[PDB]
Design a protein around this motif. Sequence first.
Motif, PDB file in Angstrom:
ATOM      1  N   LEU A  37     -47.490  26.979   1.942  1.00 37.19           N
ATOM      2  CA  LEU A  37     -47.106  27.931   3.065  1.00 37.19           C
ATOM      3  C   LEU A  37     -48.285  27.668   4.043  1.00 37.19           C
ATOM      4  CD1 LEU A  37     -45.670  29.116   0.279  1.00 37.19           C
ATOM      5  CD2 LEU A  37     -46.214  31.216   1.726  1.00 37.19           C
ATOM      6  N   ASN A  38     -47.998  27.024   5.044  1.00 33.62           N
ATOM      7  CA  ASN A  38     -48.877  27.123   6.327  1.00 33.62           C
ATOM      8  C   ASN A  38     -48.935  28.583   6.700  1.00 33.62           C
ATOM      9  OD1 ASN A  38     -49.539  24.277   6.076  1.00 33.62           O
ATOM     10  ND2 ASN A  38     -47.748  23.815   7.066  1.00 33.62           N
ATOM     11  N   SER A  39     -49.857  28.787   7.610  1.00 35.12           N
ATOM     12  CA  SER A  39     -50.088  30.063   8.333  1.00 35.12           C
ATOM     13  C   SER A  39     -48.836  30.404   8.935  1.00 35.12           C
ATOM     14  CB  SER A  39     -51.322  29.813   9.091  1.00 35.12           C
ATOM     15  OG  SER A  39     -51.400  31.339   9.868  1.00 35.12           O
ATOM     16  N   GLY A  40     -48.205  31.712   8.875  1.00 31.58           N
ATOM     17  CA  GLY A  40     -47.121  32.197   9.018  1.00 31.58           C
ATOM     18  C   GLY A  40     -45.734  31.725   8.326  1.00 31.58           C
ATOM     19  N   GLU A  41     -45.925  30.951   7.422  1.00 30.30           N
ATOM     20  CA  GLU A  41     -44.567  30.654   6.898  1.00 30.30           C
ATOM     21  C   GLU A  41     -44.066  31.630   5.746  1.00 30.30           C
ATOM     22  OE1 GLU A  41     -45.426  26.387   5.387  1.00 30.30           O
ATOM     23  OE2 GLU A  41     -44.274  25.821   7.191  1.00 30.30           O
ATOM     24  N   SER A  42     -42.779  31.693   5.602  1.00 30.94           N
ATOM     25  CA  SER A  42     -42.271  32.273   4.495  1.00 30.94           C
ATOM     26  C   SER A  42     -41.408  31.479   3.543  1.00 30.94           C
ATOM     27  CB  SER A  42     -41.615  33.309   5.070  1.00 30.94           C
ATOM     28  OG  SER A  42     -42.049  34.231   6.103  1.00 30.94           O
ATOM     29  N   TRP A  43     -41.481  31.859   2.186  1.00 32.20           N
ATOM     30  CA  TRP A  43     -40.938  31.172   1.080  1.00 32.20           C
ATOM     31  C   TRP A  43     -40.216  32.234   0.260  1.00 32.20           C
ATOM     32  CZ3 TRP A  43     -43.506  29.455  -3.891  1.00 32.20           C
ATOM     33  CH2 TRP A  43     -42.630  28.601  -4.772  1.00 32.20           C
ATOM     34  N   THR A  44     -39.063  32.138   0.063  1.00 35.47           N
ATOM     35  CA  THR A  44     -38.126  33.128  -0.607  1.00 35.47           C
ATOM     36  C   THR A  44     -37.768  32.413  -1.908  1.00 35.47           C
ATOM     37  OG1 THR A  44     -37.330  34.191   1.222  1.00 35.47           O
ATOM     38  CG2 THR A  44     -36.283  34.708  -0.873  1.00 35.47           C
ATOM     39  N   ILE A  45     -38.232  33.066  -3.081  1.00 36.21           N
ATOM     40  CA  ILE A  45     -37.975  32.513  -4.260  1.00 36.21           C
ATOM     41  C   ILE A  45     -36.811  33.543  -5.153  1.00 36.21           C
ATOM     42  CG2 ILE A  45     -39.939  31.415  -4.494  1.00 36.21           C
ATOM     43  CD1 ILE A  45     -41.180  33.457  -6.533  1.00 36.21           C
ATOM     44  N   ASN A  46     -36.427  33.047  -6.020  1.00 38.76           N
ATOM     45  CA  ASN A  46     -35.317  33.892  -7.078  1.00 38.76           C
ATOM     46  C   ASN A  46     -36.173  33.780  -8.181  1.00 38.76           C
ATOM     47  OD1 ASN A  46     -33.021  34.608  -5.358  1.00 38.76           O
ATOM     48  ND2 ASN A  46     -33.503  32.495  -4.686  1.00 38.76           N
ATOM     49  N   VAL A  47     -36.265  35.121  -8.825  1.00 34.64           N
ATOM     50  CA  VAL A  47     -36.774  35.499 -10.218  1.00 34.64           C
ATOM     51  C   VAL A  47     -36.012  36.052 -11.132  1.00 34.64           C
ATOM     52  CG1 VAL A  47     -38.743  36.701 -11.566  1.00 34.64           C
ATOM     53  CG2 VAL A  47     -39.269  35.544  -9.353  1.00 34.64           C
ATOM     54  N   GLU A  48     -35.523  35.355 -12.300  1.00 36.62           N
ATOM     55  CA  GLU A  48     -34.714  35.890 -12.862  1.00 36.62           C
ATOM     56  C   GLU A  48     -34.780  37.221 -13.535  1.00 36.62           C
ATOM     57  OE1 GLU A  48     -33.943  33.888 -17.080  1.00 36.62           O
ATOM     58  OE2 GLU A  48     -31.957  34.398 -16.953  1.00 36.62           O
ATOM     59  N   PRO A  49     -33.667  38.035 -13.687  1.00 33.51           N
ATOM     60  CA  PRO A  49     -33.653  39.344 -13.998  1.00 33.51           C
ATOM     61  C   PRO A  49     -34.519  39.454 -15.469  1.00 33.51           C
ATOM     62  CG  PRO A  49     -31.801  39.070 -12.930  1.00 33.51           C
ATOM     63  CD  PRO A  49     -32.400  37.858 -12.984  1.00 33.51           C
ATOM     64  N   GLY A  50     -35.041  40.578 -15.808  1.00 33.14           N
ATOM     65  CA  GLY A  50     -35.728  40.455 -17.177  1.00 33.14           C
ATOM     66  C   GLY A  50     -36.794  39.737 -17.137  1.00 33.14           C
ATOM     67  N   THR A  51     -37.667  39.118 -16.208  1.00 31.90           N
ATOM     68  CA  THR A  51     -38.736  38.536 -16.211  1.00 31.90           C
ATOM     69  C   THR A  51     -39.940  39.425 -16.648  1.00 31.90           C
ATOM     70  OG1 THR A  51     -38.148  36.613 -14.852  1.00 31.90           O
ATOM     71  CG2 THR A  51     -40.433  37.130 -14.997  1.00 31.90           C
ATOM     72  N   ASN A  52     -40.701  39.110 -17.761  1.00 35.11           N
ATOM     73  CA  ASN A  52     -41.561  40.047 -18.130  1.00 35.11           C
ATOM     74  C   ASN A  52     -42.895  39.356 -18.064  1.00 35.11           C
ATOM     75  OD1 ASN A  52     -42.566  42.516 -19.843  1.00 35.11           O
ATOM     76  ND2 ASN A  52     -43.412  40.732 -21.041  1.00 35.11           N
ATOM     77  N   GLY A  53     -43.810  39.918 -17.451  1.00 31.14           N
ATOM     78  CA  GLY A  53     -45.306  39.408 -17.402  1.00 31.14           C
ATOM     79  C   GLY A  53     -45.105  38.172 -16.429  1.00 31.14           C
ATOM     80  N   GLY A  54     -44.540  38.417 -15.290  1.00 25.80           N
ATOM     81  CA  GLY A  54     -44.676  37.379 -14.057  1.00 25.80           C
ATOM     82  C   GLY A  54     -45.739  37.534 -13.237  1.00 25.80           C
ATOM     83  N   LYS A  55     -46.088  36.638 -12.690  1.00 22.41           N
ATOM     84  CA  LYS A  55     -47.221  36.549 -11.533  1.00 22.41           C
ATOM     85  C   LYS A  55     -46.970  35.729 -10.352  1.00 22.41           C
ATOM     86  CE  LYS A  55     -50.772  37.433 -15.182  1.00 22.41           C
ATOM     87  NZ  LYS A  55     -50.623  38.883 -15.525  1.00 22.41           N
ATOM     88  N   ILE A  56     -47.537  36.354  -9.226  1.00 26.97           N
ATOM     89  CA  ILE A  56     -47.582  35.467  -7.987  1.00 26.97           C
ATOM     90  C   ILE A  56     -48.885  35.577  -7.528  1.00 26.97           C
ATOM     91  CG2 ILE A  56     -46.869  35.465  -5.566  1.00 26.97           C
ATOM     92  CD1 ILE A  56     -44.042  36.343  -6.821  1.00 26.97           C
ATOM     93  N   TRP A  57     -49.403  34.496  -7.030  1.00 26.91           N
ATOM     94  CA  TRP A  57     -50.787  34.355  -6.455  1.00 26.91           C
ATOM     95  C   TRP A  57     -50.796  33.465  -5.441  1.00 26.91           C
ATOM     96  CZ3 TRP A  57     -49.295  32.246 -11.076  1.00 26.91           C
ATOM     97  CH2 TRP A  57     -49.543  31.020 -11.425  1.00 26.91           C
ATOM     98  N   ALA A  58     -51.930  33.047  -4.566  1.00 30.91           N
ATOM     99  CA  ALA A  58     -52.296  32.005  -3.725  1.00 30.91           C
ATOM    100  C   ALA A  58     -53.054  31.153  -4.336  1.00 30.91           C
ATOM    101  CB  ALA A  58     -52.735  32.636  -2.425  1.00 30.91           C
ATOM    102  N   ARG A  59     -53.193  29.957  -3.962  1.00 34.02           N
ATOM    103  CA  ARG A  59     -54.297  29.046  -4.327  1.00 34.02           C
ATOM    104  C   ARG A  59     -54.583  28.202  -2.845  1.00 34.02           C
ATOM    105  NH1 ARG A  59     -50.486  24.931  -7.414  1.00 34.02           N
ATOM    106  NH2 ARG A  59     -48.924  25.835  -5.839  1.00 34.02           N
ATOM    107  N   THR A  60     -56.147  28.109  -3.096  1.00 33.91           N
ATOM    108  CA  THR A  60     -56.616  27.671  -1.770  1.00 33.91           C
ATOM    109  C   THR A  60     -57.121  26.432  -1.767  1.00 33.91           C
ATOM    110  OG1 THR A  60     -58.680  28.860  -2.165  1.00 33.91           O
ATOM    111  CG2 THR A  60     -57.168  29.999  -0.822  1.00 33.91           C
ATOM    112  N   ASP A  61     -57.204  25.492  -0.674  1.00 38.05           N
ATOM    113  CA  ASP A  61     -58.041  24.286  -0.786  1.00 38.05           C
ATOM    114  C   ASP A  61     -57.530  23.303  -1.741  1.00 38.05           C
ATOM    115  OD1 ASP A  61     -59.845  24.975   1.803  1.00 38.05           O
ATOM    116  OD2 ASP A  61     -60.868  26.196   0.539  1.00 38.05           O
ATOM    117  N   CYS A  62     -56.076  23.043  -1.520  1.00 38.69           N
ATOM    118  CA  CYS A  62     -55.543  22.295  -2.542  1.00 38.69           C
ATOM    119  C   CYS A  62     -55.274  20.750  -2.007  1.00 38.69           C
ATOM    120  CB  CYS A  62     -54.051  22.738  -2.673  1.00 38.69           C
ATOM    121  SG  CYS A  62     -53.901  24.410  -3.667  1.00 38.69           S
ATOM    122  N   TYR A  63     -55.228  19.691  -2.773  1.00 37.66           N
ATOM    123  CA  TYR A  63     -54.871  18.500  -2.483  1.00 37.66           C
ATOM    124  C   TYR A  63     -53.773  18.363  -3.646  1.00 37.66           C
ATOM    125  CZ  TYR A  63     -54.695  13.619  -2.617  1.00 37.66           C
ATOM    126  OH  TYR A  63     -54.210  12.070  -2.578  1.00 37.66           O
TER     127      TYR A  63
END
Length: 207
Positions: free
Chosen positions: A31-57
């Motif tokens: 995700l570049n600065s300003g970008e939006s990404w829409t994901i679908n997460v299955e109903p019933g997902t238990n213990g899901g997490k979303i995070w950012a990662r920085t300085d990747c290659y």
Amino acid sequence: ATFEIVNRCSYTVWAAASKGDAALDAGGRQLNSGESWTINVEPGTNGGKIWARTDCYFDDSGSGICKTGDCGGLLRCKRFGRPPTTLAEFSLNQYGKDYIDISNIAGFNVPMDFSPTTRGCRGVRCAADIVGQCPAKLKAPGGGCNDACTVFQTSEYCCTTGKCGPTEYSRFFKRLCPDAFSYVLDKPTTVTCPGSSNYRVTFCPTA
């Protein structure tokens, strides 16, 4: 459920989405600065997490490294990320409701808002300058503010026995971000939302 992931930071991030033993959707994306990404997460997902990662290659096969939040060197995460990581956490369709929180238990890298896009509940936010204000002993040289469990590996910080209290380190996170979990046994800041709500995770919401 839909999660729109929005990067309002001035820097690129690599979003990640996992339930620990599997990817959610594709599991990660740039995700570049300003970008939006829409994901679908299955109903019933238990213990899901979303995070950012920085300085990747990443190479053309999707293998590489990130300085914060690296999930086994993959672009498309299947596992949780390396601290420090600000965490958007959720369990969906749990006896008719969804449950959301932000956690600093695995440290902080990028500020975050986690809000419903549908009716019936409020969002949570951790957008203070935790990296800038980070206690010296918690600063991650690779970037971010580590949690004390990561740094010191004690029963008290890691809450290994199910018995721990707040600490000078947890209290730092809690002072900067009252609405996020600061240690395992923190007084909960989980929000109950209608089952099958949809959400937006915004990195750098006050950017």
